[PDB]
Design a protein around this ligand. Structure first.
Ligand SMILES: *[C@@H]1O[C@H](CO[C@@H]2O[C@@H](C)[C@@H](O)[C@@H](O)[C@@H]2O)[C@@H](O[C@@H]2O[C@H](CO)[C@@H](O)[C@H](O)[C@H]2NC(C)=O)[C@H](O)[C@H]1NC(C)=O
Ligand SMILES: [N-]=[N+]=NCCNc1c2c(nc3ccccc13)CCCC2
Ligand SMILES: [N-]=[N+]=NCCNc1c2c(nc3ccccc13)CCCC2
Ligand SMILES: *[C@@H]1O[C@H](CO)[C@@H](O)[C@H](O)[C@H]1NC(C)=O
Ligand SMILES: *[C@@H]1O[C@H](CO)[C@@H](O)[C@H](O)[C@H]1NC(C)=O
Ligand SMILES: *[C@@H]1O[C@H](CO)[C@@H](O)[C@H](O)[C@H]1NC(C)=O
Ligand SMILES: [Cl-]
Lengths: 536, 538
């Protein structure tokens, strides 16, 4: 006897989901729904094609394969790195999506939240424990969707102008999943007329690229960009740079000269051979730089995100944007000498100068000197704790905080309704050292509501805090406003404007309104540093 | 002699002098005013180094101030005390090389530490005869022997054709040096100790003090130094030989002296003094503020290298220095040449007026350097706020010309063995006639250090009188011991030495001493470390 709540018919055919247990009650989950033809063989590097219809009842009770990617080996056995590693088998046959809905299915159309994971466009999976949509579905009545999209060479290797490897195919995988939601989410009780995209890091940069790409704009109504932006120094490469990186990668794997022959030879290569050389194509020694990322193709991205955010009309848009307290701290242990998760990472002045060259790899000698002079505390210029913290701030400000301030400002000046935040709470369970503070991605578990599971050992304060964040995010998805039409005791979260520059602190204390998101420092990155590059 | 006050008759190397008994609030003082220390630098002697005054016959009357060195007079605000207190108060003349001595009455029984005052006025103005430089309070209250000299200013003191014999440059600094040599030889006759000489000066006077620290022949003439709101390093105190040559050549063309250095200088010597003064402001390379036409030149003689190079390589182990700044160094300079600024209104300016002001205030800045300044000083939370823009403009001028050259000097001196004490003076005189927005302008600490509030007729508050006494004590304890702290008063907060490690300085105001750290540390790293690199590369 089948559960009729677990039986759904979508355009491709019948699906069978699973009844999952959330702390407050059951939820319906439809996991591993195919949204595209497997992008394998001749389809490697090609745009996704819609999944052909299937016969019978497709089993949607388990997560599907993770898109082929590099697996972190930096610290084996360690939860801090391993919680981000694939938790299902790696395969190029990975274009599946997941749906969580209340149990029983909503009676009236419910706002939809679509999650786009991060992982520097080279990693990630919609199946990670921290992206579990059951708490939002059960507590807030949300319809949550998450898709896998191609990463690394598979999703972003490009030979711009070619038909066989046009670039941005991982973003086209995301778009195809958004199209799938428009066409099929009503069958799950979701409202296709109320779709909110939310993502973190490369997922937030992806959300921003859907805001900037006109064919995606009819597929969603609101957006959340957590610790990532389409503008900035890592999220995109020029066509010339993508071409150089693809050509070098092909040379490294013995390929093959026309694009057709090069791409055909790359298609014969085992997936692990491409992954084995993907990190060898970066132009300089660097951190917070990824080999295969979205390309300014003149197609998905008609111009650079910088040009599109300056000239765009965003009147019809509501956006929630923010950062964590220590955006850059993870990136330091990965490639800056003197940094380690196993010690306090107290560094010398020489190590700070060398770190700035790795952290700002495009910087000339004069630009790197300007960074060092701005971030040095001239009262304590040799203090190792100050230097360690300044190094973390350089990386986080350059890559995330100042591109976010730039984006928030441009969106607000061009008609968008913008809400901004800083997330400052460090999870009690965090296994990374205290010096790393709140690293990138450690807000996600709170927004998804993992502290609501009593077996995960978060504090009572953390459980109450997670409930407050779930409410801000779902109130934003429902209304374009994170404010509750009920709690007059907590201060209101004001929209971010170019005039007042208001943002809120998200921590265990009630919301606090602050003005100017690193205003002086971000004028250095956003206004001065470009001028120092343009004239040199 | 016979019927005169026997306490006022003194002999010096050049001959006999008769001084005057002056009244200070607490009692009498001896003053020997208008003592000639050089041959009048007139006629063929114009632009030439000073020659020592030849001996005179009879008793020279030293009872009144002598002539002020020929200079530009500010007539912008008729009757305004704010400008007029700095204007000449005696006849303008090229015959101006005289000095003044104040001592206790009767003269000290044992050798007393000497304080030598060098006035400021951008190397184009000033006089040792101004009321704010009155040595009688320090002589009476502290028992000090105070000396002040007139030195040539403008073209007369600083016009140079480097390499020429007739106009070698720095002759105004040589006038100061000749007065220091005069003190070494003659001050014992007044009860002064030639083995305990402290130089103190403000603004161009402080820059002059710094140049005596950096010029070896002056080093044997003093033991300690006070630099108030001025330094030898920085953007206004010196010019290169090439720049001095360009300015002198242009001035000569402007007065009808055309093209050989001998002929040019000989023609400049035939010109009336007022003709040179009338054209001296026309030779500046750009529209600017805090820039003076005729200043010390890096000649390879008085200054063997640039002050920047000499402060970086110098050994200052044997030296004790007191250095500091006022709260609003740049505010006066804005009313003089920045559009939108006035002493008669609040001077609330627009962003456009701030950018134009930065070009005038940092005249050497390229487009990129000027934008770095604007971006650093803008409050990005209120980028168009007129009060912040007005205050940022004042801070740009003050930091670039005084605060950051002072921090640079204090750091180099301390790292190279000197004992340094640093301060910020934050008290605005209750009597001040400049508007409140101008805060504490440059030079408005001088009247407190000289002890003018001790005179009940000047209308300072009781707190100001107590504050002046405290400052007079810091300055004279520094002159006596190389330490401004009183050893028999450990109850009062101590003034710690400035070091590269702790960067400690004190606030001088009506409240007891407060110790602060980092003299505008972040902002001065911008001016002292970044901006030179922005010039050196682009
Ligand atoms: C403050 O005054 C200045 C100077 O103006 C003069 O002095 C005034 C007190 C009054 O007597 C005026 O009639 C005088 O002209 C003003 O600065 C000028 O502003 C204009 C327009 O912005 C500009 O084109 C000029 O170059 C400026 N001139 C100078 C000498 O600065 C200023 O506008 C006044 N500010 C305020 C807030 O009223
Ligand atoms: N860039 N890349 N990062 C991959 C490393 N894995 C991590 C991810 C995130 N946060 C991390 C924090 C610490 C360590 C690894 C992390 C957030 C987005 C998902 C990927
Ligand atoms: N530079 N120059 N300034 C000449 C104008 N006179 C003034 C002086 C000083 N302070 C002033 C403050 C306000 C107005 C004129 C001033 C201190 C040094 C002596 C000269
Ligand atoms: C921290 O650990 C790394 C490990 O390679 C080491 O290089 C660094 O010197 C250590 N720092 C301290 C302060 O011990
Ligand atoms: C929670 O703590 C208990 C020990 O009290 C431990 O057995 C359990 O595994 C912890 N849970 C997690 C998710 O770490
Ligand atoms: C001092 O105050 C009196 C009024 O009590 C006034 O007439 C005089 O002009 C003032 N003098 C000074 C120097 O301010
Ligand atoms: Cl780069």
């Amino acid at each position: 006897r089948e559960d009729p709540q677990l039986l759904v018919r979508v355009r491709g055919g019948q699906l069978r989901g699973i009844r999952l247990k959330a702390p407050g009650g059951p939820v319906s989950a439809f996991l591993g729904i195919p949204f595209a033809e497997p992008p394998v063989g001749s389809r490697r590097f090609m745009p996704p094609e819609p999944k052909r219809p299937w016969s019978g009842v497709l089993d949607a009770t388990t997560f599907q394969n993770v898109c082929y990617q590099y697996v972190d080996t930096l610290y084996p056995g360690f939860e801090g790195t391993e919680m981000w590693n694939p938790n299902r088998e790696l395969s190029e046959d990975c274009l599946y999506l997941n749906v969580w809905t209340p149990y029983p299915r909503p009676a009236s159309p419910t706002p939809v939240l679509i999650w786009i994971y991060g992982g520097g466009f080279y990693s990630g999976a919609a199946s990670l424990d921290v992206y579990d949509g059951r708490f939002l579905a059960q507590v807030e009545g949300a319809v949550l969707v998450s898709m896998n999209y191609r990463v690394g060479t598979f999703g972003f290797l490009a030979l711009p102008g070619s038909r066989e490897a046009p670039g941005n195919v991982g973003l086209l995988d995301q778009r195809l999943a958004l199209q799938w939601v428009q066409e099929n989410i009503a069958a799950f009780g979701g409202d296709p007329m109320s779709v909110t995209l939310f993502g973190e890091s490369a997922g937030a940069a992806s959300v921003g690229m859907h805001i900037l790409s006109l064919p995606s704009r009819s597929l969603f109504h609101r957006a959340v960009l957590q610790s990532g932006t389409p503008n900035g120094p890592w999220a995109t490469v020029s066509a010339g740079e993508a071409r150089r990186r693809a050509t070098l990668l092909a040379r490294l794997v013995g390929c093959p000269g026309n694009d057709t022959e090069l791409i055909a030879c790359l298609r014969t290569r085992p997936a692990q051979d491409l992954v084995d050389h993907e990190w060898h194509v970066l132009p300089q020694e660097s951190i917070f730089r990824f080999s295969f990322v979205p390309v300014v193709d003149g197609d998905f991205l008609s111009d650079t995100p910088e040009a599109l955010i300056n000239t765009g009309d965003f009147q019809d848009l509501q956006v929630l944007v923010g950062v964590v307290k220590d955006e850059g701290s993870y990136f330091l242990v990965y490639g800056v000498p003197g940094f380690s998760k196993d010690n306090e990472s107290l560094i010398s002045r020489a190590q700070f100068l060398a770190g700035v060259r790795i952290g700002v790899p495009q910087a000339s000698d004069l630009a790197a000197e300007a960074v060092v002079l701005h971030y040095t505390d001239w009262l304590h210029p040799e203090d190792p704790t100050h230097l360690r913290d300044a190094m973390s701030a350089v990386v986080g400000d350059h890559n995330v905080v100042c591109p976010v301030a730039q984006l928030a400002g441009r969106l607000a000046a061009q008609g968008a309704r913008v809400y901004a935040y800083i997330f400052e709470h460090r999870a009690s369970t965090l296994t990374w050292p205290l010096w790393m503070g709140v690293p990138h991605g450690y807000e996600i578990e709170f927004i998804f509501g993992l502290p609501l599971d009593p077996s995960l050992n978060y504090t009572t304060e953390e459980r109450i805090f997670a409930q407050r964040l779930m409410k801000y995010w779902t109130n934003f998805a429902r209304t374009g406003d994170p404010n509750d039409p009920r709690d007059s005791k907590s201060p209101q979260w004001p929209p971010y404007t170019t005039a007042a520059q208001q943002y809120v602190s998200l921590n265990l204390k009630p919301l606090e309104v602050r003005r100017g998101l690193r205003a002086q420092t971000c004028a250095f990155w956003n206004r001065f540093l470009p001028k120092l590059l343009s004239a040199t």
